[PDB]
């Protein structure tokens, strides 16, 4: 499987709204609101790299509340 950590910036007053969307997703294993330039860090897992590609470009990046993301694929 593929494990990845996604750092996210959400629109103001929407970080909780996004967390609630994420915590209902099978791929999300853990999610936290964090201090700093990023609002959240999310740990996700997919069977294949191709599924991760789809998840992030279709589910995450298309979420109206998300303004930016930086994903760190784990070895």
| Cα dist from 53 to 12, 49, 60, 67, whole Å | 26, 6, 10, 18
The CA distance from 14 to 26, in Å, is 21
**51 touches a second copy by CB under 8 A:** no
Q: Select the binding partner of residue 25 from a second copy, ligand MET, none (C-beta < 5 to 8 A, by kind).
A: none
**33 touches ligand MET by CB under 6 A:** yes
Q: Nearest CA to 32 among 64, 57, 22, 62?
A: 22
Q: Select the binding partner of residue 63 from a second copy, ligand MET, none (C-beta < 5 to 8 A, by kind).
A: a second copy
Binding residues for ligand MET, rule: CB under 6 A, are: 6, 15, 33, 35-36, 38-39, 56-57, 61, 69-71, 75
């Amino acid at each position: 499987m593929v494990t990845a950590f996604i750092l996210m910036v959400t629109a103001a007053g929407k970080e909780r709204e996004v967390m609630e969307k994420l915590l209902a997703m099978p791929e999300v294993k853990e999610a936290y609101v964090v201090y700093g330039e990023y609002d959240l860090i999310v740990k996700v897992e997919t069977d294949t790299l191709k599924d991760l590609d789809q998840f992030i470009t279709e589910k995450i990046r298309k979420m109206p509340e998300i303004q930016m993301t930086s994903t760190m694929i784990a070895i």
